[PDB]
Amino acid sequence: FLDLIQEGNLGLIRAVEKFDYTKGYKFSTYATWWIRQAITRAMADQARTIRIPVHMVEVINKLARVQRQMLQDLGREPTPEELAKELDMTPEKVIEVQKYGREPIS
DNA sequence: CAAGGCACATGACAACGGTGTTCAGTGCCGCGTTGCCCGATACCCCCTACCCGTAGTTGACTGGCATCCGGGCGCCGGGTCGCC
């Protein structure tokens, strides 16, 4: 948690360095974007034991959230072909990213 | 009856027979190993597809988390604030 807080502080430093009153709005609304940017970047780059590239992180979390949405909607485990058409990629990519989306056991 | 004269064979005599050595010369032919000719190959090129890193995204949105008790048991050892 405090490590995330540190990273958000870095994102704030960036946003502050990249802010002025030329925008007719509060700093916080503008900042929330940079803060989430830095936090998501670090979560993609430093959270897992195995280092996963950013596009791979977004692929996995996108397929995960949409699969969860299918679980909530259908009330049943979506069949892999359904997931493949939903993500629009092939089942091969589905299994690839799924297996790439695990964590070690200590 | 004894001596002298003719047949057949006989002591050597070389020279062929046949074959065995030996010289001496030149090969014969055993294997070892060279010189070719091909097929494939690793190694340069070009092209685009896709992974991987970087940079933005403007209503507002200003302090979190769940801890933890039934060890148990004793000791050391230091700290810690009263004590007179």
DSSP structure string for A17-59: HT--TTSSS-HHHHHHHHHHHHHHHHHHHHSSSS---HHHHHH
Quickly give A47 CA vs B10 C1' distance in Å: 142
Radius of gyration of chain A (CA): 18
- Please, which experimental method was used? cryo-EM
CB A70 within 8 A of CB A86: yes
Quickly give A11 CA vs B73 C1' distance in Å: 52
Query: What gap in Å lies between CA A99 and CA A96, rounded to an integer?
Result: 5
Quickly give A10 CA vs B16 C1' distance in Å: 135
User: What residue has token string 């998501």?
Assistant: A40
CA distances from A33 to A1, A7, A71, A92 (A): 19, 14, 30, 34
Query: What gap in Å lies between CA A95 and CA A101, rounded to an integer?
Result: 10
Q: How far is CA A41 from the centre of its chain?
A: 8
Strand B nucleotides in reach of protein CB atoms, 7 A cut-off: 51-62, 64
Query: What gap in Å lies between CA A39 and CA A87, rounded to an integer?
Result: 25
Minimum-distance nucleotide, CA of A18 to C1': B56
Q: Is A63 exposed, middle or buried (0-12, 13-18, 19+ CB in 10 A)?
A: buried
User: What is the experimental resolution, given in Å to one decimal place?
Assistant: 4.1
Question: Which structure tokens are listed for A1?
Answer: 């948690």
CB A80 within 8 A of CB A94: yes
